[PDB]
From a paper:
Since the current full-length model of OGT is a composite of two independently-solved structures, in this work we determine the structure by cryo-EM of full-length unliganded OGT to assess how the catalytic section is oriented with respect to the full 13.5 unit TPR region. Into this map we could readily dock two copies of the X-ray structures of the catalytic region and most of the TPR 11.5 section. Interestingly, we captured only one dominant conformation for this TPR region into which we could further model TPRs 3-5 for one chain of the dimer. Notably, by cryo-EM we do not observe this 40° kink but find that, in the absence of crystal contacts, OGT does deviate from the previously observed 2-fold symmetry with each chain being related to one another by a 173° rotation. We note from our cryo-EM structure that TPR 10 is shifted 5 Å further away from the catalytic domain compared to the OGT/UDP X-ray structure (E334 Cα to H529 Cα comparison). The positioning of TPR 10 in the cryo-EM model widens the gap between the TPR region and the catalytic region compared to the previously proposed full-length model and leads to a propagation of increasing discrepancy in the positions of the TPR units as they extend away from the catalytic domain toward TPR 1 and the N-terminus. In the unliganded structure, the immediate advantage of having a larger gap between TPR units and the catalytic domain would be for protein substrates to have increased access to both the TPR groove and catalytic cleft.
Although thousands of proteins are subject to this modification, only a single essential glycosyltransferase catalyses its installation, the O-GlcNAc transferase, OGT. The catalytic region alone can glycosylate short peptide targets, however, the TPRs are necessary for modification of full-length proteins, promoting peptide cleavage, and engaging in protein-protein interactions.
Author numbering:
A (entry chain A): 79 to 624, 629 to 709, 721 to 746, 761 to 1021, 1025 to 1028
B (entry chain B): 181 to 625, 629 to 710, 719 to 745, 761 to 1028
The structure:
């Protein structure tokens, strides 16, 4: 009863709790209406902590007497402890309806909703409380907490200050207000409030963590590190401190220790998706790609909100060539938010690799406007523009590019430009060599992972059976012009004193040239399945050796391993590679005199006559003679067809210009050309046009096969005026500069009937070219753009014009030899760098002293003369046609002999322990 | 989905901001393409000052509707909320293109300019908005604000009037209205519109602050205090409310309270030179010499800056003589205050009055009128009350001009009868009427820079010659004032540089008090030491003759009474604090009881008829020590002066100093500083307030009076010289730094004037040490206080009238005012 319940109270006060609870139960059984009995009931339940016992006891109490107000408050406390929120809210509603004012119960409901997740109602009820409870420490504290959750810090400062009025010093409230200040950006206010918290009590380690976060906001490395360490000493239970300490340590450069911190933090809890990102990033930095991808996928699967995970996984897929997956990741990242410009920059790189230049240009513009200093994005945008040759804001862009070049050169960062792109920006020779050296030692940084001991370079040929073991190493043995330039030399390489080793490093294509050169080699090697440069280097060292350079996908770090005693760059890159392991480089005096060695990082091997090589004497010998270049015809049986003709017009020159009268054969040919027919047969000779030779024989069109049929070609097939002196040049838009185009405009204005022949390289840039020509005052008739044709037909249609063109920006090597074998002459102006001196040296080997201009004006004047002086033009054309065969320019066998002589010089130099001059 | 949006819109209409944002966040989750919902959510977020969320909602809304006018307008409103210039201006351009017919867009754009500086385009957009409509009276408001910035004052007045006439719903408009009313000088309507605005919105505290400023112009001190209270309770952080509250407390003499509130302002703003200088003045009053040099030098910098910044000088010219600044600085501040007069007189639009150059209009005489509010209970009237009666009616006509209501004091009505004419100007609210009356009086030739002096009247120039004499011991800086009276020594040519008026040199001095009239009973006294016990009375000689024997100690002598039954009975009465007794039929009293026995005679209105005795021991004054004395106002004392006094004390074996509590709040710090300067508490004596007669009388017991080098004791010097008492003084820098030496020269005792502070201490100790020297000096000063005409107020009037003769001979000959030499 009442007295027995109070005796139970005495029992609890004296310490005998169980007797207390038994007497409470007894008194309740006597009269359940006991308010004191219910109080002792609740006290016993709380001491026991029985959730269901307390729940049912309070249900019985409330149904017995619902007036109990604070009892409903403790009921809500219990329901919150359970976690079931609807019961708590219903109880709060019942209490408020029964008695309107419960600011404490309203605070309880506010915390309930804070658990529920609706900030706004929470702050609303907080204000309700602070109104009806002007002094309520919990109300203001939780209000500040909810505002901190909602990022609305300003009201939180006032709420926490009023709580401070209620509690003049409390560490938790100080830390919360410090977080409010940090989210305010109030660095000093935040650090002060955090130090107020720690002086309130140094127990909280997360206090140290947050203080060191403020320190990092101020950038104090060591002090923040000390705070993090001390917090770990107090508690390593939470891994946020470990995570940020790992972050800063990672920034320090002591890598693997911070890596271990990352991994153990993630061990503490997988929820640190950011730590997962850091781990995958360092995995990529070390080359652990697949696991990094797995971690990024994990982070996305747990946290689809973030997108820079997509960015970095796209970076991984770039490292692993997964273009499709990378683009998917970029799409997801941009879909989350496009404000992350560098993601669009990587997507632009992807499109550039894909040829979607305009999208990349637009994305790069968006990035650069987003962040003014994105030197890599700026450089890549410039590269895309030079791809499309849009000279809008041309020279100012070049100037800012030079500025970015110097800026990145100073701060020891990777030059955003590429060595192939170097000629697009005529910077200093020092800039050239610095970029090349940095990119060459990019191989060194990768090769350092295995720390392979240096190979014992053989010194004598006795190990190699008295023969020179030469290893030709390239992944480009296939659909590539360089192969289409030197593939015959392996066969023509002399096996008498030299052994041939050829190393394929890319998936095979099945082309005739591939297996052809494979058979040419004394030893073909298929390295295209060795992911480790070390294994390939070991294989080479086994081969005891005594082509790609800065090319897409190339992995020349094996050269940095120097498995051969002599390593020299040649035909791989148009210039020096900045490679300390490239002992020599093969060039000529005409293009590389000893005086320009200031920009050269390798020793110079001098070719007595020429360095470049091509074998259209074998690649396309059928075009050695043809049947002045308006409508031209060629075929395997040219002389046989001519002798099968009724009448042939003979033009004297041991040479002649074969001329056919406009007879029935000629008229039928013209009709077939005009009707776009497949081909016809005349006199038993297959007469074909070039517009569908692939449908006739694509392999023959590739030059793998010499076209056995007979091809007649007319400029009218392109709709050209068949009575005009036509200029031509077909290289990609990169070789084009505004100044040379204006000089060409001057040439075309000087020459009465002057038009220019162009190839769509690429296509979509035509409007810019037309606008530039109009601003240079030349009509559309002066320029014609055409789709691309295979190499054989490329050279075939090249000789249609009387003269080609030269851009001293980048010299002519591919098309230079194409036209050297086309018999159509061309003039050029030498440059400073090798890439601007290729065609020049080609013509020096040709020996035409008058095909070099020492100034742009000289170039223009000679161009006008030759396009106008048709008698001098004909003499030059005949001299070119004679000398392209008479000269050893295509004597690839004797070229091979002289290369062997140069190899003899190299091995005499090395074997004696020691630049090669002839 | 949309239904929850509608319910949230309803709840926002009910005014639940947070329920509104909750429901609208729910709606935007329900419909990501709910443009109008994003609009409403951003709007309510802005209502609740929630910037970033409104930013996001509005960015989405623009993605859903690329162009809506009010959308972009409120976007720019939030842009103002966080304050970004380019965002604001570009949003304004997009708004004006979106809807040209929307004035408030132009208004906020003008606000952007206002924070930027393109005030031109600001007013331009104002005009454009007016062209669209004058309904948006907000435009009227802020355009009148920028006009007030410019100075098209009356035009701005028109703007504010018409804007309020559009609608009174904009309290700030009423506020600026009352502000300009105060600026021009009309008060009652300003207060009424203050109350109008406060009725509309009682929230604005500085509204109450300016109400209080207007009331202080009305001089309703209680109104000032109540407005201060309401303002500071609405906001204590408003440093200006505290500053002006402390100013009013300084007016009420609450110097510590003013110091506290002024330090409150200084913490609310580190450098508020106005409250800074007023706090400094309060410190000077209390002489809290802590933070001495930093405060005073920052004041020097402040006054130089405001000389450059052409602002209101914070240091009042009364305090000019206090701060050690330049002659140019002080006369420049004086000229600034002269402008503060002339600008106000400009609205009176009165062309200059006629200025006679003859005597016939004044029936062969010269009309000189005297204007002041100090007619009555004021030291000036206590200095020169009888001289108006001593003016010659044969050559001059006397005119009085009361600037204060009559107090009924004897001096007041006495001088009113002395003057040939009295005028009660204190009844005239308009300066124009007073100047017209003066011109009616035909005046050709007294407070100066002081409290309540309507100096604008002198600015009005109703008299051809306007001069200031002994009214305020500093220059005016106002060229409309012509002359100032001085002597050969105090204000020589080398100091003439700091006067905007012409100088007037008296024969030997220009100072005079009514001691010879108000206190002649001390002409001779009654009491081996010299001034241990003092007794005087009208029947003093009769009592002495009624005595058994009276000793005579030297035509001049010192009456002495032996220690007989009567003398010892007087001693006992003193030790008992008896009100009064009567011996031999002669009533015997003390000054301490003269408050009730005869307050009128104690005030100098009457000569004390009774015989009154007093001695040192009445207040703990040792009877065998060298007692130096000085009793001026506390602010006239500085640490350097106290240290000079410390040197003088340490150069005398047993010397004590008598002082006053003026008031007493600062005395503890004073004595603490004295202890810091090695001065024992026994060596200093303090006394409470004493009325004129007794405070003058008590000096005779003391030995030597003192003069502060910075400022002389104007009243005090006359008080001590009428007692035949030596005093130490030195020629200083300011005019008020040479008055005491001027009186010493007038007495001719030049050896009592020291040339330096070292010589100051030398002469002080020399006097306080040698018995023959001190006694003979005291006696000779006693002799010469009557032998010299120093108190001949009639001869003072004679020389004043001779100077009048010379001045009128110069002026009536067409000459502009010129320095009077001899």
């Amino acid at each position: 009863a009442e007295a027995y319940s109070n005796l139970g109270n005495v029992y609890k006060e004296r310490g005998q709790l169980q007797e207390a609870i038994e007497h409470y139960r007894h008194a309740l059984r006597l009269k359940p209406d006991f308010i004191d009995g219910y109080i002792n009931l609740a006290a016993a339940l709380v001491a026991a902590g029985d959730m269901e016992g307390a729940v049912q006891a309070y249900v019985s109490a409330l149904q017995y007497n619902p007036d109990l107000y604070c009892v409903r408050s403790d009921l809500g406390n219990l329901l919150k402890a359970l976690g079931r929120l609807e019961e708590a809210k219903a109880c709060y509603l019942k209490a408020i309806e029964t008695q309107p004012n419960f600011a404490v119960a309203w605070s309880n409901l506010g915390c309930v909703f804070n658990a529920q997740g609706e900030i706004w109602l929470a702050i609303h009820h907080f204000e309700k409380a602070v109104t009806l409870d002007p002094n309520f420490l919990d109300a203001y504290i939780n209000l500040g907490n909810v505002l901190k959750e909602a990022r609305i810090f300003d009201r939180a400062v006032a709420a926490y200050l009023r709580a401070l009025s209620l509690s003049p010093n409390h560490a938790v409230v100080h830390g919360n207000l410090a977080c409010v200040y940090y989210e305010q950006g109030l660095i000093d206010l935040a650090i002060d409030t955090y130090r107020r918290a720690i002086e309130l009590q140094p127990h909280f380690p997360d206090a140290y963590c947050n203080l060191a976060n403020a320190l990092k906001e101020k950038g104090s490395v060591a002090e923040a590190e000390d705070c993090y360490n001390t917090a770990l000493r107090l508690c390593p239970t939470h891994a946020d401190s470990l995570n940020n300490l790992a972050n800063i340590k990672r920034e320090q450069g002591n890598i693997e220790e911070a890596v271990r911190l990352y991994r153990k933090a993630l061990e503490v809890f997988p929820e640190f998706a950011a730590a997962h990102s850091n781990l995958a990033s360092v995995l990529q930095q070390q080359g652990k790609l697949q696991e990094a991808l797995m971690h990024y996928k994990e982070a996305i699967r747990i946290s689809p909100t973030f997108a820079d995970a997509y960015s970095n996984m796209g970076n991984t897929l770039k490292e692993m060539q997964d273009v499709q997956g990378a683009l998917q990741c970029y799409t997801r990242a941009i879909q989350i938010n496009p404000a992350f410009a560098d993601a669009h920059s990587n997507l632009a790189s992807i499109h550039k690799d894909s040829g979607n230049i305009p999208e990349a240009i637009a994305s790069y513009r968006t990035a650069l406007k987003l962040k003014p200093d994105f030197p890599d994005a700026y450089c890549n945008l410039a590269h895309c523009l030079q791809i499309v040759c849009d000279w809008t804001d041309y020279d100012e862009r070049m100037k800012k590019l030079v500025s970015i070049v110097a800026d990145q050169l100073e701060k020891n960062r990777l030059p955003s430009v590429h060595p192939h792109h170097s000629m697009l920006y005529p910077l200093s020779h020092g800039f050239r060599k610095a970029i090349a050296e940095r990119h060459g030692n990019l191989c060194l940084d990768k090769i350092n992972v295995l720390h392979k001991p240096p190979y014992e370079h053989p010194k004598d040929l006795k190990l190699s059976d008295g023969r020179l073991r030469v290893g030709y190493v390239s992944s480009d043995f296939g659909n590539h012009p360089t192969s289409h330039l030197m593939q015959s030399i392996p066969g023509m390489h002399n096996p008498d004193k030299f052994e041939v080793f050829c190393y394929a490093l890319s998936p095979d294509d099945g082309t005739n040239f591939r297996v052809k050169v494979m058979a040419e080699a004394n030893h073909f090697i298929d390295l295209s399945q060795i992911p480790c440069n070390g294994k390939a280097a070991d294989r080479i060292h086994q081969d005891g050796i005594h082509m790609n350079g800065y090319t897409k996908g190339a992995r020349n770090e094996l050269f940095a391993l120097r498995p051969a005693p002599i390593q020299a760059m040649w035909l791989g890159y148009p210039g020096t590679s900045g490679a300390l392991f490239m002992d020599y480089i093969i060039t000529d005096q005409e293009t590389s005199p000893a005086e320009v060695a200031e920009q050269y990082s390798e020793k110079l091997a001098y070719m007595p006559h020429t360095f470049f090589i091509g074998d259209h004497a074998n690649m396309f010998p059928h075009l050695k003679k043809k049947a002045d270049n308006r409508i031209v015809l060629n075929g395997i049986d040219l002389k046989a067809f001519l002798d099968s003709l009724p009448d042939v017009k003979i033009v004297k020159m041991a040479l002649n210009m074969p001329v056919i009268p406009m007879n029935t054969i000629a008229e039928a040919v013209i009709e077939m050309i005009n009707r776009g027919q497949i081909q016809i047969t005349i006199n038993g000779f297959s007469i074909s046009n070039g517009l569908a030779t692939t449908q006739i024989n694509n392999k023959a069109a590739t030059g793998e096969e010499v076209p056995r049929t007979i091809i007649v070609t007319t400029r009218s097939q392109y709709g050209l005026p068949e009575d005009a002196i036509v200029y031509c040049n077909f290289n990609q838009l990169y070789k084009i500069d505004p100044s040379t185009l204006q000089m060409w405009a001057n040439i075309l204005k000087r020459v009465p009937n002057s038009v220019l022949w162009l190839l769509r390289f690429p296509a979509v840039g035509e409007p810019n070219i037309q606008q530039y020509a109009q601003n240079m005052g030349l009509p559309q008739n002066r320029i014609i753009f055409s789709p691309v044709a295979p190499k054989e037909e490329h050279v075939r249609r090249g000789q249609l014009a009387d003269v080609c063109l030269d851009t001293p920006l980048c010299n002519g090597h591919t098309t230079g030899m194409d036209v050297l074998w086309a018999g159509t002459p061309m003039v050029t102006m030498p440059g400073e760098t090798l890439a601007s001196r290729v065609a020049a040296s080609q013509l020096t080997c040709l020996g035409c002293l008058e095909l070099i201009a020492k100034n742009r004006q000289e170039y223009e004047d000679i161009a006008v003369k030759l396009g106008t002086d048709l008698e001098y033009l004909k003499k030059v054309r005949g001299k070119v046609w004679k000398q392209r065969i008479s000269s050893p320019l295509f004597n690839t066998k004797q070229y091979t002999m002289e290369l062997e002589r140069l190899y003899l010089q190299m091995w005499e130099h090395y074997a004696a322990g020691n630049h090669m001059i002839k």
